[PDB]
Design a protein around this ligand. Structure first.
Ligand code: 1DX
Length: 182
């Protein structure tokens, strides 16, 4: 994925656990070569997973867990580090922002074509409930979506309960989440 995701992981770990740890996780992930990640450069999705795997061991936490944390962090990180207005242009509420993703990503891919964006459909069951379909060319990032949602919940001071009712990794076509929100 574009370096942007890898810098984010690095920024989070470093900020929460110091460079010593980050350097460690980097060496273990077998990436002690890469002196630094380039934001607008396309890397092999495997580069990210390796960082997730190494961070899992080095921190004694499970991948799925860190992915949740990274989900939340991403929403904050992007607004700060050069993507505030892009995010601001996505809406003034969770439900709206989620409908804008497909648009938002298209909007982004234009600048960066090697972008392989996921699809996000939404059936608004009610005015406080919606069903989210997450479709991706990657595997094992459902947990990050979980974090992403909560991050959006904080961004719009909205209480939100997210629970996953279908999992790709277990055969099912694609991940599906059920969402309740204040
Ligand atoms: O793999 C999957 O299925 C998706 C895994 C989850 C990661 N995606 C989160 C989507 C999301 C969900 C959400 F709920 C809130 C916010 C969200 O993001 C807002 C946002 C998304 C992207 C940029 C941005 C900014 C700059 C750049 C570039 F560097 F210039 F290229 C590139 C992307 C900014 C803000 C983003 C994503 C998607 C594809 C690629 C790639 O294909 O590499 C990289 C990252």
């Amino acid at each position: 994925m574009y370096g942007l995701v890898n810098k984010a992981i690095q920024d989070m770990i470093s900020k929460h656990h110091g460079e010593d740890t980050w350097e460690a996780i980097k060496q273990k992930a077998g990436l002690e070569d890469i002196d630094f990640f380039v934001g607008m450069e396309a890397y092999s999705d495997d580069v990210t997973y390796h960082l997730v795997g190494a961070a899992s061991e080095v921190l004694g936490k499970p991948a799925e867990e860190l992915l949740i944390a990274f989900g939340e962090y991403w929403v904050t990180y992007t607004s700060e580090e050069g993507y505030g207005e892009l995010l601001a242009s996505a809406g003034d509420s969770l439900p709206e922002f989620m409908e804008n993703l497909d648009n938002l990503h298209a909007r982004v891919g234009l600048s960066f074509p090697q972008l392989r964006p996921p699809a996000f459909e939404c059936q608004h069951t009610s005015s406080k409930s919606m069903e989210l379909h997450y479709q991706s060319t990657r595997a094992g990032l459902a947990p990050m979506v979980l974090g992403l949602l909560h991050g959006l919940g904080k961004r719009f001071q909205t209480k939100v309960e997210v629970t996953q009712t279908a999992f790709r990794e277990t055969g099912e076509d694609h991940d599906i989440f059920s969402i309740k929100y204040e």
